Design a binder for this molecule. Sequence first.
Ligand SMILES: Nc1ncnc2c1ncn2[C@@H]1O[C@H](COP(=O)(O)OP(=O)(O)OP(O)(O)=S)[C@@H](O)[C@H]1O
Ligand SMILES: Nc1ncnc2c1ncn2[C@@H]1O[C@H](COP(=O)(O)OP(=O)(O)OP(O)(O)=S)[C@@H](O)[C@H]1O
Ligand SMILES: Nc1ncnc2c1ncn2[C@@H]1O[C@H](COP(=O)(O)OP(=O)(O)OP(O)(O)=S)[C@@H](O)[C@H]1O
Ligand SMILES: Nc1ncnc2c1ncn2[C@@H]1O[C@H](COP(=O)(O)OP(=O)(O)OP(O)(O)=S)[C@@H](O)[C@H]1O
Lengths: 624, 174, 48, 58, 163
Amino acid sequence: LKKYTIDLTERAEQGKLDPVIGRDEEIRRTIQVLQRRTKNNPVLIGEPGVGKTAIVEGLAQRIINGEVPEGLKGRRVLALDMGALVAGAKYRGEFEERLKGVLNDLAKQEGNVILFIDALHTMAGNMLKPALARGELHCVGATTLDEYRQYIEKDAALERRFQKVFVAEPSVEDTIAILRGLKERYELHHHVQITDPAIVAAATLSHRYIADRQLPDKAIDLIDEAASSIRMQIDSKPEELDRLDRRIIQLKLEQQALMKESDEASKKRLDMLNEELSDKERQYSELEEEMRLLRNKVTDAEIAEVLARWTGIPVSRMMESEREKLLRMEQELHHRVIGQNEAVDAVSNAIRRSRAGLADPNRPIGSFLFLGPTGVGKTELCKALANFMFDSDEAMVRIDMSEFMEKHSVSRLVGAPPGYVGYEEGGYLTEAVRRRPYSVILLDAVEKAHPDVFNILLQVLDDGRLTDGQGRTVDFRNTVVIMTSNLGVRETERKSIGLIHQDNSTDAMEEIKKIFRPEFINRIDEVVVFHPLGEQHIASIAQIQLKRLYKRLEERGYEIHISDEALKLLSENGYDPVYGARPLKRAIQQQIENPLAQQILSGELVPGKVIRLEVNEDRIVAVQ
Amino acid sequence: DAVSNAIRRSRAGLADPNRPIGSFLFLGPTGVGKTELCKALANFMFDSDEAMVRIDMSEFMEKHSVSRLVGAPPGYVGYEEGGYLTEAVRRRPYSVILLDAVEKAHPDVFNILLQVLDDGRLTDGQGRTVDFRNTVVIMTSNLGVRETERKSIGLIHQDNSTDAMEEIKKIFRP
Amino acid sequence: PVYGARPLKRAIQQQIENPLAQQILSGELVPGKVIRLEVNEDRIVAVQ
Amino acid sequence: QIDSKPEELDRLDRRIIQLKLEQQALMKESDEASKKRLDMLNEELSDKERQYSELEEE
Amino acid sequence: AEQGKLDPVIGRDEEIRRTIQVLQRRTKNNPVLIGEPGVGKTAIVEGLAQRIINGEVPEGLKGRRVLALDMGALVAGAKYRGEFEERLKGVLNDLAKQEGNVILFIDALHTMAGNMLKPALARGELHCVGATTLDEYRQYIEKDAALERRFQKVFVAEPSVED
Ligand SMILES: Nc1ncnc2c1ncn2[C@@H]1O[C@H](COP(=O)(O)OP(=O)(O)OP(O)(O)=S)[C@@H](O)[C@H]1O
Ligand SMILES: Nc1ncnc2c1ncn2[C@@H]1O[C@H](COP(=O)(O)OP(=O)(O)OP(O)(O)=S)[C@@H](O)[C@H]1O
Ligand SMILES: Nc1ncnc2c1ncn2[C@@H]1O[C@H](COP(=O)(O)OP(=O)(O)OP(O)(O)=S)[C@@H](O)[C@H]1O
Ligand SMILES: Nc1ncnc2c1ncn2[C@@H]1O[C@H](COP(=O)(O)OP(=O)(O)OP(O)(O)=S)[C@@H](O)[C@H]1O
């Protein structure tokens, strides 16, 4: 008891055990087990982070703090932790000897020293049952759910040794009382003065967002991380000084990339960045020679910037300048997708209300069932939205739902039942959107998937979470979906002419209301129906079809200027009454790119010189 | 009044001990607020929507989904991880369970469900007994929406009951 | 008749709350005061 | 229950220990005009002290 | 690193501020670099060592020095029941002798026993550095809320042209 044990009451005497304000219920549950003769060893069972070790050591905090009544005063808490019994016994038999020594010690305590097994799955059993049979061992269990059950559940002799402990959960109120009850201990443990908004945002926002740990402790280590980044601010220089100096370090690593060259002077095209280097010396000198350089407002906005680096709705963007690209979000789509006014306003306004957040957080954000014709370019619009917000097309997780015809379809895409290859491989959308849950959940042709797939669209559209075969919640409460499904193609291509719009809504709503409930008609953002294009739109997609060719042949170092007559021939070959604007790239390549390749390989086009496409033909030809 | 009188019967004590406490079949058009009322049922007596999980019978249609509700056969992943029904009831047997669209489930969940109803004992992949004899279940349906919203004009309630009980009759027992 | 008062969630958030979000985040509406649902013209507009 | 303080007595004493150590949390705040709302927990604490004094006497 | 035998880095300041900013905690205290074996995360912990030792770092990481428990001498002679145990308790007590002025960059973080590592990481008595592959940080474990209270990660994405 003097060699192997750690005195938890002494830990609560000096105060290395962080004081626990509240929860008298389960410490009273411990004391109620301690008066109990049989089933005398309590087992603290919660999730990890219900504080099982901290409830035994806080039971020592009660035994020193006198909140315990008569009966246990004198019965001493001494904790056999792991690591203690692992002494230099290189040979056998001495283990049973030293255990016989310490069980003669608690055998002569006679209810004066209480034993404790920290992380109960450690310790034995061949010797504690006599010491739990006379009345001489008084041990305590504190370990997790899996480590108590797999410690032992099913021995009816050892569950005769161990009683479990179960809890009750009130509101976020007493979590706020944990955070204010601990915030000055982490002032003198975290070098600050904890104002309230960081911890009340930690409590309420922890009860809203975090689906991995539990109240209040997820808020507690959020304040740990918070005061960590705060002391990162405390011991460094003031703010904009570190803006200047840190961008000096990283950007001089960029010029460190941008100096070791073949010819240094000609590719010093970054000369503005070096005048800006001496300018960073200039304003960085203004602010080194020269609060709002301080934050006791920790802040909710700034650990909302940390959590905003986590989730997928930012607030670090919120203190930036964003309204100028918001007010021409239509026109910044018109740089690559022109026309379709109720589509760019219904879709773009649906993006505004979506990432603005006007619905339930326990509802999805941008929820779209697309229904309409072809000849439009849906995946290039999905690339316009990943290349719009995601700034390039990583989010385009394209998972075709066409494969799913037989009985076992939700074992296919949801994930297989365990005990097989398919569960560890998981489902299709379940896994490839399990990697990025807060992203574009892009789907083509969902209608051929199961009714069960339809009602788990009713799960990610009502609830906004997903469940595989095992039974956990993949969180979708912070993602925008795009469903470029192939529901519309035959109905909306076949509807012209002879079928009015209410009839396509009638039989398409006979498919939806054939399987879905009214919330699939209702709870999407918009039913976005497209229309065919005009001639100036053909001119615009010619221009932006050329801008990619400008940057592409720009990487080689050539120049091409095109007259208006070739524009007139492409406008002539642009539109057909049956198909629309799709074969334009094929006509451009078949009439333009054949003599261009023929003369760039033939030798008639000279490198290092400007190229111009003229017409010494009845079609487009190349010349120098 | 139906669910509230079911609560007064629940805390009152009328029930047969070889039965579940509450079991109902809801039919009709959709738009009434079923699982919002189940969120109020998670709000009233044990006081928390944290204790509302909402369970579905749709994804569980396969050859091994019987071993999803009972746990896998031995020698499998999900045998040591168990099943959703056996672990879920085995943690706290006195709780509120929210099922959806049981027609999606097989006649093997209807016979495990019969063991919820009759004689009160479920044997899993392993085979040990499962305590179901004081458990409250809630099961919603799509039989109401898929033949009521179009037949709301003209049809009567008895014929609604019969043309539910036909496809029920093909795949359930009385 | 089939649908009921179910779409009224998005009749509110869609039908009024899109220009309301435009006017709140536009900077016209300074926060901090008691809101009275005023009447501009025949489509519902909230004014601060 | 006979050796120590009675059941309704330590229900009450432990409700007032919930509210009192809840105030030991609830002292240091951020701004006054928002988070000194807790008037209602104070009059509930008056029910706590009065009922605990009543069954303290009885 | 004083002798300068290690590999340099180019750029790498924002997400290594994510590495230092995930270093200086108490429990969750240890960073994890995420990514496959063709990205270079050991250059990020050793460029971390070059910021700590060379001196662009502010106050706090001036004197900190990094050690490395490896599995090789752990499994070298495990002849009897206790050799590996006397040697690992020697590791933990030598962690106690430099008193937390030992940084322990454990690469292959799941390799390092553990119930003797958990409470010292919990009190503040232990503080290390972790590293595991993208798929293998999906394999490490995140739902053990205890081992959620022992470690934390650093985010790195798909590489670009300019870098
Ligand atoms: N009210 C509180 N007062 C003080 N510290 C608290 C409080 N709530 C949580 N903690 C912290 O909770 C942390 C975890 O407690 P533990 O003693 O590890 O209990 P535990 O859940 O059994 O951990 P194990 O045994 O490793 S599973 C400690 O580091 C405490 O700082
Ligand atoms: N606006 C556009 N800009 C650039 N390329 C386009 C455009 N529209 C179509 N394309 C090209 O033509 C192809 C067809 O466009 P998509 O965006 O895939 O149309 P789609 O309806 O999504 O076809 P799916 O996905 O096979 S049903 C694209 O992959 C591009 O190569
Ligand atoms: N009348 C209503 N009152 C309140 N909330 C409603 C109502 N109707 C729908 N909801 C919301 O929409 C969700 C689904 O609608 P429900 O009324 O529960 O019908 P349902 O049959 O449960 O559909 P589910 O939940 O997808 S199986 C609920 O969880 C609520 O969030
Ligand atoms: N950041 C870097 N800076 C400098 N050289 C690097 C860098 N990353 C990789 N290298 C080079 O690549 C070689 C090995 O790359 P590693 O850094 O070991 O890749 P890795 O991601 O660490 O994968 P491991 O270590 O095999 S798991 C080194 O010998 C260097 O030549």
